[model samples]
Target: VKLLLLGAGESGKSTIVKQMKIIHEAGYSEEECKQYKAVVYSNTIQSIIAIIRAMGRLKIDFGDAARADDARQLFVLAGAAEEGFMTAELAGVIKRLWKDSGVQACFNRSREYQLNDSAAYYLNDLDRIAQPNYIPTQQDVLRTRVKTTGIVETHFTFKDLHFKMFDVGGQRSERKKWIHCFEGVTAIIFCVALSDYDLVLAEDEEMNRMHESMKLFDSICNNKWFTDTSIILFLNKKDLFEEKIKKSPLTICYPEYAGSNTYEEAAAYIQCQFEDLNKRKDTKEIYTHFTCATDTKNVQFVFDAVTDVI
Candidate 1:
């Protein structure tokens, strides 16, 4: 069986892939963990740069001109992905900049950018991760943010069925590559980050992330090629949404949403957006699940149920 994981970027597709590895593949090797160190640093740096840029655009003063200049320089250098940039020498400076009230203020308005949920985790522990002997833990590896630029596949056998799972890049530029694998897919595990209703896309800030996701889901569901394929809706990052909805109203994105700011109500509304867009209701049922892809047990339960359905 071939299972395709589809979603917008940072919608927990990679995290779901990690959970599958932890559940079935015995987790990652020490060397593999080491490989993620640089990516974690990159995530932290990009997040800081994103916040600083947002602050600049919003005309928020950093309270120190020297620190602001340093942040801008770090932003430019960080984008280059240079090695040794996360060293102890830079950790202290970055930490101070990140902890600055101005930076925190910028982070408060993060809905304007595509900062990862794990940004603070890596940022807060920069000093430790900067060490020479650092190695990421299972949770650290799972939470580390890295954009999937191409297709990634994992093969495993479950319940006597040989399964090949494909996780593709969810960014708009990368969506074109999806066509190469859509022909023979047995099922599509469409992921949507439930917490993304307030955010905009990194590639295109003009477009709302969840709105883009709804449109993409519509296109995929209504595609003529996948008319008979079973479509599973993995409404992911429920944990984040549960917390975010308390502070950020869903009406900001969906003004039509008159429901209460509770998880069940908001999730149902978002699910309806996808369901109402389906043109193949006669041929397929969009199997739905509220998932926290980072949680092993949560994903394990969902995967088992999905296997039975598929």
Candidate 2:
């Protein structure tokens, strides 16, 4: 019952992962930290060299979307460690799991050879380097546990299914690399921003990123790799309801899309948008729901969605 979780940066992927992990572990408490970890992403060698070449002042080599996404999962297992990234306790957990389990050998992209050793090698390639059998197994899928206060008596059932979920960076230049992980996915969770839905439909800011994500989503549907796959729309940050309302021009911001084009329309609009996105792709299931990290009721719905998938 493997599932791939994805979304734009800060769309609550991490929160979902953490909640599921806690449920899976029965209960594991991870300490909250002030320092957030960096998200991993692939970019051109030129960009990497430039950042190194600049020394220290520039700071952000690439948009942290793939780097340090404020709240997205890194897919770390209990007792494992990522260099310069994961915390000692988290790393220890992942390492312990890796040591105890029949873990696969390290086949990171960094180990791939330069352009010189491609098609030309022929027989020699087969003899010398075996292509990594990139396949999913139950354990490869990580069970992420969230560290929260008291007991989380969640109603969701999180299954340990191996899957490779990619949290692609929304920046245009960074989007090209996201497709590298598209093959063999049970689903592609296209994280559409309710705040950016207008921009999404209007072909405005983040247009290229949106196109890349939607194209990937459409391709999966077209190829039938994910025929019954689920596309869940996350209307994040409902905590800032007033901010959204104040910024809109019309007295009723959710005009055409919302179920009711009235001055105060969130619930109806969310339901309408959910129905709309579900129909956009050839999927058996499509769901839309609102989320406010600070709000319990909003958070519960997200868990309900996960329970549905698992």
Candidate 3:
């Protein structure tokens, strides 16, 4: 069973996998396991803590998950399965983990989590901090944000399936790589951070940039690969549901008109635009659902909905 998770920045894709690993190792009798899951989220430092605990208790080769530079350590925990990664034995491990193993207990725990993106656990290593070395300091490359992309493979024994997972960069420049792996995907998880909409709407430049993202999303829905692919939309950072409610009309209503509304009567106006856009005749597939990935609220609801569609 291969499960792919995609989404914008800070939407909890990395956290989801880390959570999965924690659940897989729950048999350990350590009290750290009892209390650790709640505080862990993605950040260079937090990952190190989880890495150390995961290594010590899970008996996996995490080799100083804190150190961030252990090529040998990661080899043990995940091995050198780069790019097109998949092994028959590993497939079996995934199969058991997703199906026969005790995942529901962890899922229940996941539901209790507050809506927030899991912080990246390990990133202090010079290597983790820099994807490419020795850049021109004056080359207009003056941004400091971390983004990496890869495909993760796992099997689901209960579903009697093998899944190939692909997590793409949610950043603007790196987003092009997402569509490259769309073919042969059993499922595609589109993630969104709740914090993004608020910040984007506050700044005009950011708001215009966000339109580009929506174009990509609409492209995903309109694309041919999606015709048969199972699509999942994860709205992360649900902890801000209250904050979002205050901005609801602007957040929900403006985009269809591209911020042209002067009056409050926008629904019918937007529907008319949608009707006009529909005439272009290329839009297709068009199925979507809501989710708070970290909170796990309605996450399962989305999953069950996918099964109904497929």
Candidate 4:
């Protein structure tokens, strides 16, 4: 059997894939865990750079000249690392600047910009993470935020079937490559971030991230390539969604959503939004699940239930 996992950037596609490895496969080795340190570091530095750039664009000041100067230096170092010219001294400079109050303030305004959910959590532990002997735990590895560029396929056996799961990049630029693997899919796991209602696309600040996911789902469902394929809609990041909804409300995305702020009402409302977009015939089935991808036990239980349906 073949299953394709689809979602927008930061929609927890990679996190779900990681969970599959931890639950089904043996999980990452010590060397593999060690390699994620660089990924986590890169995620941190890039997030800071994004905040600074967004602040500049929005005409918001960091308030401190010295901190602003350090932010600029961090931007330069981040760019160098992107180009394979990173040094330990450059990394150390960011570790120090990460603790600066000005930088912290900029991070607080991350909702205005595009920042990873795990950015603050990882940045808070920069002192320990920056150590030479640091090693990432399974949870740390799952929490690490890195954008996917190409397709990643994993083959494994589960429930007496040989499963081939395909994870594709979710950014707008990456959508063109999705067509190549559209054929021969047994099931399509359409993952969408429930917490992204108020967030904008990382690549395009003008576009709402949740709206983009809706449009993408519409296109996929209407496409003829997957008419016979089973559709599993994963409304992922329930933990974050529940928390964010309490403070951020769902009306920002669905102005007509008059339901209570509770998780049940909000999740049901979002599910209705996606269900209305389905173009499939009534004969086909679209299974939906509210998932917290980072929670191992939660994901394992959900996947087991999904496995039975597929």
Candidate 5:
């Protein structure tokens, strides 16, 4: 069995791949957990840094002036992926930053900029994460956000059937080097982050991530390859989207979006947009599921649903 996981770089494709290991590969070993420790810290640090940095770019003022020096301390973290990041002084700074309403306000405005779905997860749980020799839990591992720098694969057995899943490297500046290995894929698991509705792309600030996903999907949906092959779409990260749309309007992305600003209505509108793009113009069939990638039961249930079609 073969399936290809496709999505924009920040669309939680990595978390989906990690869930496969949790479900079928007998979960991750301690050695694997060891690697996530550094990643978890790096994710938390950068998560706060990005929100603060966005405050400057978006011209959002700080709610509390006292934390300005410590906030600048957060921006000073350079080459942060190395060791020596974890210290009592830095931990206090990170915790204090989170305490301020300025950081919380920027985080609430996640739709304006790119913030990882898991950023809030690791940021809010400082008590456990700030330990001296903290080893990441399996949940922490899934919640850690790291860029998918290279292509990765997950192999597992699904009830007498051997399975191999591919995560094509997301966010290529140009399509010159990516997607050439697609002819053999049995199913294309294209994902769209629900909370990415109003976010801007790092590659191009003017381009909206939601529109980017729609355009990217448009090509694949109409492409000559895999017309008869199984195609699955994931509207993943509903946990954040539900909270996001509550405050941010869906109209920002879809200018004429006239629906009430509610999760149920907004999600359906977004889903229909994709549905509108993919008509039966090519005799194609698609499988889709709403997902929160970090929730084991949720992902496991969706994986079970996919097993039926594969």
Candidate 6:
């Protein structure tokens, strides 16, 4: 079996890729998980800096003045080579600042700015993560939001199947190279961030993220080169989407959306947005799943169903 993973940035594509490593590939080694400690610390520090940057743009301030020094200190640790951000002192500041009312307020407006979905997962676990000998758990690695720059391949087996899964970068610049990846595949897994409706693109803020996903999906799904390829639409990041739609309306991305802001109404509408894009619905087959990629078991279950389709 061959699988192609495609999506817009941070649509949890890499997280799904990581889950396959954990669930099917017998997980990572102690050394591998240890190396990811650098990345995990990098994620926590970088996510906060990104949040702090957003707060300035949004004109949000820390609830307490004491947090200013804390935020300033974090900027210094951001440059830490490997182990410094994981230091106990820096981790404490991250924990307290994350609890600051203003920081939480700005985080709620994260759709207006950029921040990884891993911020809370890492920040909330600082007590354990800050331990000097701490090693990243499978869940922590799954929640990590490192960007994919080039094509990554994971070869693994499940039951009687022989599988080769290809994960390609989702950014605009890298997309040109992905044409080479399409030559052979059993299925194309197209991912989209369901909660990204209110956000702007990382590459171009002028473009709405959700709309970008739609455009990319349209290009891939309707492209004739893959006319006979199996298609899997991962409506990824369901947890974020459920939280976002409660406050941010679906109308922001699709002005024509007129349904209630409830999760059921909104999720179905977004699914239909992609569903309606299929001009070849009569003969072509497309399988879709509402997924929370950070949830490893959910991805495992979804992936099992995915193999059934192939």
TM values, all candidates: 0.91, 0.43, 0.47, 0.87, 0.91, 0.95
User: Could you tell me which residue pairs clash in candidate 6?
Assistant: none
lDDT, candidate 5, equals: 0.81
Query: What are the runs in model 2 whose C-alpha is more than 4 Å off?
Result: 18-34, 37-166, 197-223, 250-267, 270-274, 277-283, 293-297
- Candidate 1, superposed: residue stretches over 4 Å from native: 63-81
Better of 3 and 6 by TM-score: 6
lDDT digits (tens) for residues 154-252 of candidate 5: 788987889888776568553444566576888888899998887888788898889999998888877787677788999999998988888788888
Give the Cα lDDT of each candidate: 0.84, 0.36, 0.41, 0.82, 0.81, 0.85
* Leading candidate by TM-score: 6
- Candidate 1, residues 142-245, lDDT tens digits: the string is 88877788789899888899989998999989999998888799999999999888888888878889999998899898898887788999999898899999
Off by over 4 Å in 6: 81-85
**Model 6 TM-score, 2 decimals:** 0.95
Mark the regions of model 4 whose C-alpha exceeds 4 Å error after superposition: 58-102
User: Worst 10-residue stretch by lDDT in candidate 1?
Assistant: 79-88
- What TM-score does prediction 3 earn? 0.47
Residue 65 shift from truth in candidate 4, angstroms = 6.0
Best model per lDDT:
6
- Model 2 accuracy (lDDT, Cα): 0.36
Per-residue error (Å), model 1, residue 190: 0.3
Off by over 4 Å in 3: 1-3, 16-146, 201-209, 247-284
Candidate RMSDs in order: 2.4, 17.6, 17.0, 2.9, 2.2, 1.5
**Residue 163, candidate 2: how far off, in angstroms?**
7.3
* Model 4, residue pairs in steric clash: none
Per-residue alpha-carbon lDDT of candidate 6 for residues 250-293, written as tens digits (9 for 90 to 100)? 88889998889899889999999998899898988789999998
Clash totals for all models, in order? Answer: 0, 13, 19, 0, 0, 0
